[PDB]
Amino acid sequence: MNPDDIVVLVGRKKSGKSYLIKHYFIPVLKAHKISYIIDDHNLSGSEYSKFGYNATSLSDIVSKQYVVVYDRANDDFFEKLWQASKLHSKKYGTTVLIIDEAYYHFKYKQKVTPAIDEALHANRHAGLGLILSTQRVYDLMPIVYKQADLIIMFYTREPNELRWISKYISAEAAEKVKTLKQYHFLIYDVNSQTIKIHKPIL
Ligand SMILES: Nc1ncnc2c1ncn2[C@@H]1O[C@H](COP(=O)(O)O)[C@@H](O)[C@H]1O
Ligand SMILES: [Zn+2]
């Protein structure tokens, strides 16, 4: 794998999306001593509170190695977060920014600020990987899928979703996602146009 990859996770509630982040991605990052920042929008105790230092200021995001951000509010937040995260990776080296409700920052039809643009196109220069998760394929700007290194998808047969997957990801991906069993997930490697059907994690 690669710490500075953009990984997009797509699946409904209880599909196994969060489980994959909590019991695969997070433990493997830790084990390899890859630092991470969790931009957490779910609530006392954030969904990801157990997995890092619960930051209460921008300075905490820069200075703590494993950090959880409670994102429950100004509209320039991502720009602030992004700035803080860049300073974080200068200190800790390559860092994964984990965003569990990615449609907050990368929603379909939203304007693209320079920060969002850097996040999608220059993330390796910035020393920052991304793990973005969303409920439906069509929640995010199509551009996110074009810029992804890896796209992970759980079962769906929703026709709008299949059309988006064919159009912006892979028509072959759109074929295989229809037959995924519970907790199984398709991995599409954007760079090698490779598909792998992965079994449920242990
Ligand atoms: N091996 C497994 N892979 C994925 N999900 C599992 C597994 N075993 C149990 N689950 C259940 O699936 C939930 C994950 O759903 P989600 O909120 O989409 O992550 C967990 O909280 C468990 O209740
Ligand atoms: Zn956020």
Atom number of ligand 1 nearest to Cα 15: 18
Radius of gyration of the chain (CA): 16
Burial class (CB in 10 A: 0-12, 13-18, 19+), 15: buried
**Ligand 1 residue neighbourhood (C-beta within 6 Å):** 13-19, 183, 200-201
What resolution, expressed in A, was reported for this entry? 1.9
Element (H, E) at 98: strand 95-99
Which atom belonging to ligand 1 lies closest to the Cα atom of 19?
Answer: 19
> What number of CA atoms fall less than 13 Å from residue 103's CA on the CB side?
11
Residues measured by CB to lie within 5 Å of ligand 2, the ion: 39, 71
Query: Solved by what technique?
Result: X-ray
Rounded to 5 degrees, what are φ and ψ at 6? -90, 120
Say which ligand is closest to the CA of 79: 2
Q: Is 60 annotated as a binding residue?
A: no
> For the chain, which domains are there?
1-202 (3.40.50.300)
Phi and psi at residue 132, in whole multiples of 5°? -110, 130
Give the CA count within 13 Å in the CB-facing half-sphere of 12: 7
> Comparing C-alpha atoms, which of 142, 30, 148, 20 is closest to residue 96?
30
Nearest C-alpha to atom 6 of ligand 1 is from which residue? 16
